């Protein structure tokens, strides 16, 4: 919340659009270039997105951005054009079309790896709208976008949803959650980042032991290497030399893990009876990623149960860092770290804003120089005619 309001967004974006173009003229020039099958400058598009007055013209913006990303120059979309489109959505609805072009991703090719994600997220927080902010969290994680502490802003959000979770999670949901715990948590500053790492590693560990290792890394920015529970227990081993864990939810979730891993073993018909889909097709199409020497994780269960029982006896007795709530404590943390990080972003984002204008200026200059050269050579060939 503090980010958006204290950043002075609207003033800068109002200050940005200098171009003075027309929508129908750009649409006809574009449609022409796609008809004759030729490329299109990123300039024409940035203009077309700058000049939108309406929801209908935002529809038209969507269409021409699509039909642009399917054109030879699709790698030439700059940051300021993406920015224009996001801000235009902020002018109108902001909560539908930006999310739709982010979830579409590949087709429209917005890919705003930037403070823009932070911006969108804040404009969700102000207005509530939880679920859509959640999906946007997932897409910011899929693009692995965090060099910015949108992480905390997102970690915050995810952990909100982490309390908002009481439900039986399916395969893909468990995966999504594990990934949104892991990739967003990079945080060395606090215990909460570390215990959310534990949460994630645990969830993904469940995913692995229950279905398959392939289920985990399939489309996700995760690693195919089988050890995951071991990575979590490694983060719990880091506590011998280090102060903090947050460590209530580490307890609760790793308890659910230990409980499903336990329960699956004595009861075969209770736990494992749930997959009936195709036995012959799955036995014939059966593939094994894991080696024979690799020591399948399912055979290491007596050690895991020990470590979580050994380590949890150490941590609470040593670190004494048991949190009374993860949700609230994390909320306080990132709300505390928020303002200074804002104050650091304001300095940079501004210099970017001037840079983008410098680039647009240079490019329009090149457009003009080219057109004038073409007109001079055209007059030179039209006034005095020599051709073979």
């Amino acid at each position: 919340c503090l980010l958006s309001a204290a950043y002075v967004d609207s003033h800068k974006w109002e200050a940005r659009d200098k171009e003075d173009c027309h929508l129908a003229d750009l649409a006809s020039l574009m449609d022409k270039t796609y008809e004759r099958k030729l490329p299109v400058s990123s300039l024409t598009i940035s203009r077309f997105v700058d000049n939108i007055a309406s929801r209908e013209d935002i529809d038209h913006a969507e269409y021409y951005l699509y039909k642009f990303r399917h054109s030879p120059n699709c790698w030439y979309l700059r940051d300021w054009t993406i920015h224009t489109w996001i801000r235009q959505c902020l002018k109108y609805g902001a909560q539908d079309k930006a999310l739709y072009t982010l979830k579409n991703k590949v087709q429209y090719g917005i890919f705003p790896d930037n403070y823009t994600f932070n911006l969108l997220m804040d404009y969700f927080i102000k207005k509530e709208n939880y679920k859509d902010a959640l999906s946007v969290v997932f897409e910011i994680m899929m693009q692995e976008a965090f060099e910015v502490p949108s992480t905390q802003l997102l970690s915050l959000y995810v952990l909100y949803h982490c309390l908002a979770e009481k439900t039986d999670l399916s395969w893909e949901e468990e995966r999504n959650f594990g990934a949104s715990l892991l990739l967003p948590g990079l945080k060395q500053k606090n215990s909460v980042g570390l215990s959310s790492q534990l949460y994630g590693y645990a969830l993904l560990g469940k995913v692995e032991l229950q279905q398959g290792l392939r289920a985990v890394y399939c489309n996700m920015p995760l690693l195919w290497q089988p050890g995951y529970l071991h990575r979590a227990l490694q983060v719990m081993e880091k506590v011998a030399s280090s102060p903090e864990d947050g460590q209530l939810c580490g307890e609760a979730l790793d308890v659910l893990d230990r409980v499903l891993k336990a329960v699956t073993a004595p009861a075969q018909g209770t736990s494992e009876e749930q997959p009936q889909e195709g036995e012959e097709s799955q036995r014939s199409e059966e593939l094994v990623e894991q080696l024979d020497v690799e020591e399948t994780e399912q055979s290491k269960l007596p050690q895991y149960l020990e470590r979580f029982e050994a380590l949890r006896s150490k941590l609470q007795a040593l670190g004494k860092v048991e949190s009374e709530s993860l949700l609230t404590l994390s909320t306080q943390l990132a709300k505390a770290q928020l303002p200074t990080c804002e104050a650091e972003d304001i300095a940079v984002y501004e210099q970017r804003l001037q840079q983008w204008h410098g680039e647009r200026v240079r490019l329009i200059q090149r457009e003009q120089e080219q057109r004038e050269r073409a007109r001079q050579d055209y007059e030179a060939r039209r006034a005095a005619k020599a051709s073979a």
């Binding site: 129908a24 269409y63 087709q107």
Partner: peptide, 17 residues
């Protein structure tokens, strides 16, 4: 499955009469 956006009508009849 994805359905591409329908063809736009961008005409402003106030600018060109």
């Amino acid at each position: 499955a994805f359905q591409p956006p329908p063809k736009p009508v961008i005409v402003d009849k106030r600018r060109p009469q």
